[PDB]
Amino acid sequence: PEDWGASSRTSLCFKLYAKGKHEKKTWFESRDFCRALGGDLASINNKEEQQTIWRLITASGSYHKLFWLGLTYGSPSEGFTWSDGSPVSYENWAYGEPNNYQNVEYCGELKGDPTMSWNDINCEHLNNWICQI
């Protein structure tokens, strides 16, 4: 769908998900859902993509929700990775994150407010999610 608010043209498309609580998915379920449509969980690779997603969040009127992104812990040599294979270069971790709290947080979620900050959280948490194609 045409992004009238974009400041530059791209054919890449982000889509926000989950209107109701029962729809919410684990990180793995969200990854699989987006791949079943031919894409993947969203990666956020620069500030422009972050702003594009923030436009989608405000346009959807679904505020202050948490969304799975494609962030997942890779290894000590890599740190975090994106499920779509992009290197984690741009980062927007919240203060004190990622913190692998209690040794069980290996997936990344977006706080859908103007900060657009990321936090690592347990992959089995039920969240909204963002796909990209």
Q: What residues line the site for Ca ion (CB under 5 A)?
A: 99, 101, 105, 119-120
Which is nearer to Ca ion, 14 or 27 (by Cβ)?
Answer: 27
Which is nearer to Ca ion, 52 or 119 (by Cβ)?
Answer: 119
Which is nearer to Ca ion, 46 or 99 (by Cβ)?
Answer: 99
Distance separating alpha carbons of residues 128 and 23, to the nearest angstrom: 8
How near is the Cβ of 96 to Ca ion at its closest, in Å? 8
How near is the Cβ of 119 to Ca ion at its closest, in Å? 5
Which is nearer to Ca ion, 14 or 68 (by Cβ)?
Answer: 68
- CB 16, CB 130: distance < 8 Å: yes
* CB-based closest residue to Ca ion: 120
Identify the three-state secondary structure at position 22: helix
Cis? peptide before 87, omega within 30° of 0: no
- CB 111, CB 94: distance < 8 Å: yes
Distance separating alpha carbons of residues 132 and 41, to the nearest angstrom: 6
- CB 81, CB 73: distance < 8 Å: yes
